[PDB]
Amino acid sequence: HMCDAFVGTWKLVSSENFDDYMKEVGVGFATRKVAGMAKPNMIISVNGDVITIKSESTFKNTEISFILGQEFDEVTADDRKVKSTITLDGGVLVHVQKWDGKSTTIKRKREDDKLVVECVMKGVTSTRVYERA
Ligand SMILES: CC[C@@H](C(=O)O)n1cnc2sc(C)c(-c3ccccc3)c2c1=O
């Protein structure tokens, strides 16, 4: 029951400062422009201790599966090869990605009927708000 309130299908309804966040992570111009237009569907499911997060859009379809606290290899949508660890901290899903001596943190939070995604790299944050599909 660890992620019960996160499970579902969610659709992107707002974004703020995502272009600048992508710049900070190193995404190139053309990818930023095309990816920034996407309106992904985020599909979160749990089966035993394994959590799966899928993101489907015209830009790219991605999928990660993981166990909380257990590091895994991820190829991000912008093709970084990162080491990811996802934990639950006080009801917030906290995803840290490490690569090339850099780090970024992506937090997912349930707030009212929304799922709010906050990602941060150095001082640059973006907030992406999802609602139930
Ligand atoms: C929002 C934080 C984080 C995440 O959703 O887990 N996250 C982090 N970095 C990047 S770079 C990039 C190109 C996407 C991206 C993926 C699919 C569709 C559009 C953009 C992305 C991303 O989605």
Side-chain angles (χ1 to χ4, degrees), residues 11-16 18 22 30-42 55-62 77 128-130:
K11 54 182 158 56
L12 183 69
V13 299
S14 71
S15 184
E16 181 184 20
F18 191 52
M22 286 191 287
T31 299
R32 290 198 318 274
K33 296 298 161 185
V34 176
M37 294 292 299
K39 296 291 189 156
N41 182 184
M42 182 185 6
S55 318
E56 318 255 29
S57 71
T58 60
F59 171 67
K60 202 178 194 183
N61 300 324
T62 68
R128 285 163 69 89
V129 180
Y130 294 72

Side-chain angles (χ1 to χ4, degrees), residues 36-97:
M37 294 292 299
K39 296 291 189 156
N41 182 184
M42 182 185 6
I43 309 150
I44 306 177
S45 60
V46 180
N47 181 327
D49 297 329
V50 181
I51 303 163
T52 299
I53 304 176
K54 304 178 181 190
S55 318
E56 318 255 29
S57 71
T58 60
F59 171 67
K60 202 178 194 183
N61 300 324
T62 68
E63 174 175 329
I64 61 172
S65 293
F66 56 92
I67 300 172
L68 295 166
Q70 301 191 12
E71 186 182 63
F72 59 100
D73 289 328
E74 176 181 3
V75 177
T76 67
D78 61 308
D79 290 348
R80 288 172 285 129
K81 289 32 176 207
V82 312
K83 293 298 178 175
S84 284
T85 307
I86 305 181
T87 58
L88 211 42
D89 177 17
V92 176
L93 279 168
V94 180
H95 180 181
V96 179
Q97 297 173 335

Side-chain angles (χ1 to χ4, degrees), residues 1-37:
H1 290 274
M2 60 202 173
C3 289
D4 277 355
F6 296 96
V7 167
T9 300
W10 298 95
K11 54 182 158 56
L12 183 69
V13 299
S14 71
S15 184
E16 181 184 20
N17 209 50
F18 191 52
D19 188 52
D20 279 349
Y21 171 78
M22 286 191 287
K23 283 185 185 181
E24 176 70 25
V25 158
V27 183
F29 180 91
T31 299
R32 290 198 318 274
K33 296 298 161 185
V34 176
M37 294 292 299

